[PDB]
């Protein structure tokens, strides 16, 4: 009942399975090429017009499934080179959506889901063994998601529910690294996660924010980073962890032009930053050494500046600012230093040095 | 110089001519009976023993010629009822050869030639106007040729050059139908052509094949069917065309138990099947609609299955299989669908659905 | 490089400035609390162990500076309530030194300096406007200095250079009163100054004396009292002035158990007492009236008794005693009486009555 549909299957090898089901639609194109043994390719295009699906499998027992239900000019591309790679692509009711999966290696699992939307771009590139990647885009226009995993046992999750021009970039290199990016609504949100090493945990969330920027960089082992930005405009969060067992938490609820920066070098350092609204609030938490604990809390409108630097072992620091223009700088050197700063009002200046 | 020859002439009517010339031979029998006006009968038996010739003409200006040169127990029978019918029988150096011509109507031309061989049976039955039939048997034992034409301007050709137990059956009903059967060598080859309608062209060729079966069935106008089977054992070819301007071509070169099936309903449908060797290769090409183009090619040893179904207008399909056990099923529905499937190797499974 | 230092800043209001600098040291504690507008707090702890600094400012533009360089268990406390109050505390190389400043009012200036020593206690309490107080303690053990000023333009100075268990007490109530206490060496020296009124001048000096007691009490306007005790043990000086323009001078150079008493009531009375060594020398100078002039001089070992009483206007009296056990009693009544007594030797008894 559909006019001008095109389907091509090319199989070289032993026990290769290719299934193409084009039910309805005008000028749908499906191509499945399998070189090797035991490769499985499934393509299902339903009610879509000018939809393009391309699957290219090389190796042993590679599995690829593409399901495009409706939509105009949807493009899906799967390229598997290796053994036991699993790829899944779903595109429902989207216009001009582009999905790309490129897996090289063994036992790689990649999934891309695009439910509606226009001009949504999803790209997954996995190299190595047993890497798991998921990209989900529900609604929205011009949303870009990119995942790049190299190594073993790496878990990557990217979710974009609504919004225009939201960009998510995930890069993992190493073993057993977990990275998660969530963007629920908002325009021009940029999230970037970069993990190098073993067993690193990174999570970023941007809810209903415009022009929010989150950057997480982890190098080493067992580093945990969590970033939340809710209902804020032009908020910037930066996390940099080098070493082992470092824990960083950043929360920015509302506000415009709020900047949070966490820098940790060493083992078992804990940093927490909380910003509740306000304009031009700046928080810096630097911990060089082992077993550092730092807490920064800001609530107020206008140019609140907090800096907490801890060098050495087991230094404890707490800074709380409430009001306008409060400036607090705490620098701890040595072992077992404890600092507590509480500022309320306008124009408070506090300098704490604990050598 | 020959002992016990018998010749009988019985003519009733005006200007009937009967000539019997028995030169040499023992116990040759010739009988010519002509009832009507202007009938011409010629019998010439030379050097044959126990040869029997019978001519029976009824009507106006019927012409019959029988020439038996040598041979043992050769039997020729001509029965013409009508006007201007022409019958020719030639039997050279054959033993126990039986030739039968039965023409009823006007301007019918029938020719039977048997050069050598033992127990060869040729039968021509024409009813109608201006039908042309030719049967030729050169050598071979127990070869059976049968032609049955009813209607106007029908052309039938049957040729059997060598081989044992080869059976050719030709049936034409209608106007201006052309049918040709050729069997060059081989044992137990069966060819059957059945044409109903106007201006149908059918040609079947079996060269040096054993137990080959060809069946062609055409109903309608301007249908063209061509079947070639060369050097194959137990190969089966089936062509079924219903409608107008349908073109079917089947080629089977070598192989054992290869099956080709073409089914066309409609106007201007084109189907081509090529099988090059192999065992248990199966090809099915079904075209329901108008202006369909289908091509199936199989090369490989073992259970290659190809199915190409096209429903509607101007659907184009190509299936190519090389190797062992390849299975391809393509189903096109709608208008202007294009499908291309290429399989190489062992165990390839391809399913193409273009609705 | 220092372990376990603690610093706390709490600012409520507008344009408050708090600076805490802890360079080196073990377990140093600094706290700065500022409620109000424009308050300035500076704390600097260097190389000290277990040093405690507390600053509490309430009001407008209060200034407090504390500098503790080294020492063990040094405690500094500043409490300002009001506007434009200035407080300065310096503690250098002292152990267990306690400094307390409490200013309530406007434009009060208080300074405490403790250079070395163990268990030195300094306390300043100012209530009012533009009062200036200074306490200095250089060396010594268990030295106690207390200043209490109430009113306007009051100047208080306390100095203790060396010595053990030296006690200085200064009390001023009124306007433009100047009081000075100096203790250079000696053990168990007690100095007490009490001024009530306007423009009163009091100065007490104790140099290298043990168990010396000085008491000055001034009530009224423009009263001048000067007391000097040098190199004496158990010497007692008492000055009591009531009225206007009264001048009292007491000098005690050496000696044991020497007693000097000056009592003046009225306007423009002049009293001078000189004691040069000796044991149990007693001098009494009483002037009730206006424009009295009295001079008492004692030089000798043992129970020298001098009494000069002047009642009325412009009475002039001079008593000179040289030797042992001289007793002189002069009583002047009336106007313009002149008395001159000179005793030399042992056991001289003089009685002068000028009615």
Author numbering:
A (entry chain B), B (entry chain A), C (entry chain C): 1 to 355
Task: Quote the original article.
Curli fibers are a major component of the extracellular matrix of Gram-negative bacteria and are expressed under biofilm forming conditions where they fulfill a scaffolding and cementing role in the extracellular milieu to reinforce the bacterial community. Here we combine extensive AlphaFold2 modelling and cryo-electron transmission microscopy to propose an atomic model of curli protofibrils, and their higher modes of organization. All models share a similar β-solenoid architecture, wherein curlin repeats fold into strand-β-arc-strand motifs that stack vertically to produce an in-register double, parallel β-sheet structure with a single strand stagger (i.e., 2.4 Å) between both sheets. Our results show that the curli protofibril consists of a highly regular supermolecular β-solenoid with an absent or negligible helical twist.
As a representative structure of CS-class CsgA monomers we discuss the AF2 model of A0A0E3UX01 (pLDDT=93.68), which has 15 curlin repeats and an additional half repeat at the C-terminus (hereafter referred to as R15.5). AF2 predicts a highly regular (the average main chain RMSD between consecutive repeats is 0.18 ± 0.02 Å), left-handed β-solenoid with a negligible twist (average main chain RMSD of top 5 AF2 models: 0.48 ± 0.38 Å). A transversal, on-axis view provides further insight into the structural nature of the steric zipper, which comprises a central hydrophobic core composed of the Ψ1 and Ψ2 residues in motif a and b, flanked on either side by a glutamine (Gln), followed by an asparagine (Asn), forming the pseudo centrosymmetric core predicted based on motif a and b sequence features. However, R15.5 has an uneven number of strands (i.e., 31), resulting in a motif a overhang both at N and C-termini. Rather, a proper match of two motif a overhangs across a dimer interface would require a fiber consisting of consecutive head-head—tail–tail interactions, or head-to-tail interactions with a twofold screw, i.e., 180° rotation of consecutive subunits along the fiber long axis. Disulfide formation of Cys residues introduced across the R15.5 interface occurred in accordance with a 21 screw axis, and also de novo prediction by AF2 showed a head-to-tail 21 screw in the subunit-subunit interface. For this we selected R15.5 due to its high Asp and Glu content (20%; pI = 2.98) leading us to hypothesize that R15.5 protofibrils would be less prone to tangle up because of repulsive electrostatics. The R15.5 side-view is nearly identical to the side-view of E. coli curli, suggesting that ex vivo curli and in vitro R15.5 fibrils are structurally equivalent at the fold level and essentially in agreement with AF2 predictions. The docking of an R15.5 AF2 model shows good agreement between the experimental cryoEM volume and the predicted β-solenoidal architecture. The reported Refine3D volume therefore represents a map that is longitudinally averaged over the curlin repeats.
